[PDB]
Symmetry: C3
Subunit: 242 residues, 3 copies
């Protein structure tokens, strides 16, 4: 009945249709989704399997993710907001279950939120180990110390880089090959601050500690080295306001 409850209900219904139509995937859909009663448990199960390695057991990571989601209401809210963001804004128009299972941006983002929590809980070696796996597996390189809001859309997430001192607001869309990073300058605050509702086009590079205002749009291929005011469009190399 509630928002999360309804979304989870949709995920199960969709998974059940997919399991019935594709016997090669039926058991995996059962073990990941249909055998569970919550989004948190299914997401944790899936992330544990996706990110496991010889260093990190899938059952260990499953525990880690599940504990984090069960302990932290804001992580659950963020996951549902990000599922909604994909359902609403994804150009390829995703079902909830396909986003949950297959969307690398979405999955990397939820896993990053747990890495960020570890980082804040003074478990930085583990935060960094998790970060390394997320990069390995989802081609998403978001430093655990980066701050990101919710309702985030990560389209063709491969090669996304978000630096250590970056800040990303709510309802931001980050397309393919976006770099939110630095000049090569050593130390300190050196990564961009991205306002709510910003759209960053494919291949855009945004460098230095500059501001990208609320609702602004960055055109594809742009190299943005200056502050972009709210509700404006910046495009070009170097980027200029349009």
């Amino acid at each position: 009945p509630d928002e999360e409850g309804w979304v989870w209900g949709q995920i199960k219904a969709e998974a059940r249709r997919d399991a019935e139509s594709e016997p090669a995937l039926a058991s995996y859909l059962y073990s990941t989704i249909l055998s569970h009663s919550s989004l948190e448990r299914s997401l944790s199960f899936h992330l544990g399997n996706k990110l496991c390695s010889s260093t990190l057991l899938s059952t260990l990571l499953y525990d880690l993710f599940l504990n984090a989601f069960s302990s932290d209401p804001s992580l659950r809210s963020a996951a549902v907001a990000d599922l909604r963001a994909a359902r609403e804004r994804d150009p390829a128009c995703v079902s909830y279950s396909h986003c949950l299972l297959n969307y690398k941006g979405f999955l990397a983002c939820q896993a990053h939120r747990v890495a960020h929590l570890l980082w804040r809980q003074s478990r930085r070696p583990l935060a960094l180990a998790l970060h390394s796996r997320i990069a390995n597996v989802f081609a998403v390189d978001i430093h655990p110390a980066a701050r990101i809001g919710k309702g985030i859309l990560f389209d063709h997430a491969t090669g996304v880089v978000v630096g250590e001192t970056a800040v990303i607001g709510n309802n931001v869309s980050i397309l393919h090959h976006v770099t939110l990073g630095g000049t090569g300058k050593v130390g300190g605050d050196r990564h961009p601050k991205i306002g709510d509702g910003v759209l960053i086009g494919a291949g855009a590079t945004i460098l230095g500690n500059i501001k990208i205002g609320e609702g602004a749009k960055v055109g594809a291929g742009s190299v943005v080295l200056i502050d972009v005011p709210p509700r404006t469009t910046a495009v070009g190399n170097p980027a200029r306001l349009v």
Copy 2:
């Protein structure tokens, strides 16, 4: 004696020389190539091993690929054409066996052709699962619904993105970090149409449903937002005709 037969003959001879010279690779070359009597079986064997996961057994994928190649003459023709394309046009000048075994663009492309067939056979969940693995393993993100011709050259394929509604003709070369994608606009026909014999330079971004004419060339780093006429060169950000 036939074209495929001769190419396969070359692959075996080359593999045999490599197996004799490198004992660390001899068994793998035997199991993948020398123990088989066809290109289809060896390619299926190799793709099954490359793309397997805890979700998808290598023997299952081996069956899937082998069935597709045995059922679909055009898939076999495309694989041989793509092997020829690499042999003829690859700047690094590849042998047939090294292309078959090591070239990520070539392998991802053949696997994509099978994903495209599944998509057309109304096995879309499996098409998408296969697509996800191809992206995972070969750093090639071609949506199963994309249409691609044959004789395709994928140089430094890592980070290649080809969107859902893209169309690529025959004898096209797609270099490193090319994006054939969209603006962020939701739904519908939103990805480029690439004519026969087009060369797309490294890091080029081509967005929207625009036309890239036969024989055209796109310079490296270009952001192409307009139609490019046949036999012309477009370069720049934004791209202009030269």
Copy 3:
């Protein structure tokens, strides 16, 4: 007491602190670092685990790397120089142990040096197999025939491409998504020559056999198609001297 000895001493001390603070990582830190008495053995152990596959046993790769480091004093010097380069120049300010364990650029680079040695020892099939794994695992595509110096910094190494005929001097910094590659022209010397102490900014593309002079800087997003004189800055698409 010696330089390598001191750096290795720091690595062990750091690993020991991390193992004490994070029980999830303690055994892995013990098996990789604390149970060994040299940087070479620990790096070989780690690279063997990172790069192993169904084709290549971790114990085989461990042997391969260890033999190379034990046989080749210049490989050991290069590894220490690259550790120093990260410690000194990395904007994210890395500890030695975190660089050794987690930095993909550093690890891919050391593994590449061994691939380059194999290539020179007429073990090219194995050099290429190793190269393929390095690309797979570290998202670093450096052809085994490429020549690179030491003191190299590879920031956000994902999607780095260095072509077959490229030459990179000492104390070079190569940031995210740099391409040192070619036009699409087939055969011959077709990749850039990078002087000592050059800084190449994020997303820069440098194509053709051109010269990038000592101490030069290439701005982010640049497409460099001409020779850059020493101690100068090139920026733009196409790049111009500033």
